């Protein structure tokens, strides 16, 4: 930890006007503490100690001279420095994040399950607009032996429900086992 041979502030700070930088961008505080001359053997060296927040413990040791603040406050930086490992599991588990809703298509997870559990896939349809206020009827076919048909009041309606009809029927259907 040893390096500077010339440093020793005497107005202001210095490796500490630096550390007192980027704790201000974190919202941290820098407490200082002095524990000189501790080594039991005969090692009168200089440990300090510092804390950057107010939840941590570190410290470490420079001797009798600058390289005790500095040390302390030089190690103080390694720290930010490090904690860039993640140590979290994988995803989180909030019970929120995006938006779920889960999907909201239908003529989409339809194909899905065809191709997932081999099946067939297919819409056609027939409006009935005779008189006008009549309405639409529609016809699909899903799953391997299975015919989908739907009606709905709109166009609209009819597609939406034909898939949910089919859609509901795959879940409906127990069969698939071989026979």
């Known amino acids: ?10 107005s202001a700070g210095f490796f500490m ?12 505080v820098l407490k200082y503490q002095e524990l000189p001359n501790s080594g039991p053997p005969h090692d009168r060296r200089f440990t300090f100690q510092v804390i950057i927040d107010g939840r941590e413990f570190p410290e470490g040791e420079g001797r009798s001279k600058k390289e005790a603040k500095n040390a302390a406050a030089k190690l103080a930086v390694e720290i930010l420095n490090k904690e860039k490992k993640a140590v979290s599991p994988l995803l989180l588990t909030t019970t929120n994040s995006s938006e779920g809703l889960s999907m909201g298509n239908y003529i989409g997870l339809i194909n899905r399950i065809a191709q ?9 349809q027939c409006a009935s607009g005779v008189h006008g206020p009549e309405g639409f009827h529609y016809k699909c076919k899903m799953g391997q032996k299975e015919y989908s048909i739907g009606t709905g009041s709109t166009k609209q309606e009819a ?8 859609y509901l029927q795959i879940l409906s259907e127990e069969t698939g086992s071989g026979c």
């Open 116 to 124: 997932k559990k081999r099946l067939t896939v297919n819409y056609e």
């Open 1 to 10: 930890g040893s390096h500077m041979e010339m440093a020793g502030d005497l």
């Open 17 to 28: 006007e630096e550390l007192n930088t980027y704790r201000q961008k974190q919202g941290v």
């Open 159 to 166: 597609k939406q429900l034909a898939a949910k009809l089919a």
